[PDB]
Write a protein that binds this ligand. Sequence first.
Ligand SMILES: [Br-]
Ligand SMILES: [Br-]
Ligand SMILES: [Br-]
Length: 319
Amino acid sequence: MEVVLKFHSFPPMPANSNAKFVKPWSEKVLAESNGEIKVEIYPAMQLGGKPPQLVDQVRDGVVDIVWTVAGYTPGRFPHLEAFELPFMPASAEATSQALQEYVDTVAASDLKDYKVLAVFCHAPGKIHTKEKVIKSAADLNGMKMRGPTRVITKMLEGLGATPVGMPVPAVAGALSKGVIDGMVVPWEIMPSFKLHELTKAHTTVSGSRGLYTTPFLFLMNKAKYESLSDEHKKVIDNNAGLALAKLAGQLWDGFEVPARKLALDAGGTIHSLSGGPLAEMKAAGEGLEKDWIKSANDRGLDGAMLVKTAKDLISKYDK
Ligand SMILES: [Br-]
Ligand SMILES: [Br-]
Ligand SMILES: [Br-]
């Protein structure tokens, strides 16, 4: 029997998460169910609401599937904050597998009200400004810098910037209107919003750990999943879990390449921190890590254990 699943997300249709992740995912699900499981894709919040509401919509069955950024709803998924800490991430391939095993084990309570398809992340984000090259933390002093989540905006404050939080569709307008001077994002999301034309100076870090990442949630309504036939359940589950997280991370590592090329072809510079400037950023990061452990403790979680577990899972998959 045929079944229609409503997918909802915030980026426009050409963004990688839609065109190069959810669309081919839905095509595989269609092929492997012999045309029976039909995902209808609604990008750009085309079923109503604002990006932070995607988790409520999928939890309550307003829609059947969403892709979103966990930290767009602050405090709702506290375990996952550990993966947002400064200099936590390796490749998206390694860090996404770590995220999924984390969610399958010690962080499972965060997502108990949902059917998890995968939890994964982008390649470590970069620092973008209109024109000023960021050579060290001091260059961020007085700069109004966007981050995706409260953890990441606190990283930015710890580096000396004036933090501003917002979902990514708001960034281009905030840049054009002077609300922000720059932002952190991975390369891959930028062309969908013309962000590589609005910022020409870009900074990354050298070494084995990137600046930050933020967890993505790819989720299905639990009641809808439970209503599927055993046969349809197996198609979904064959396209879910650790193998999907790994594939997603591999995809997101690759997405950086064409997007970086667009940004440099548009006249951008890319500078990589090392040495003293990098060490200074990492030392600042350690402070936010310590503060996060306290914050996790105060919310009833073993912050120190969670940070160790995250780090050990990232190294486990860093092959
Ligand atoms: Br600037
Ligand atoms: Br928005
Ligand atoms: Br780069």
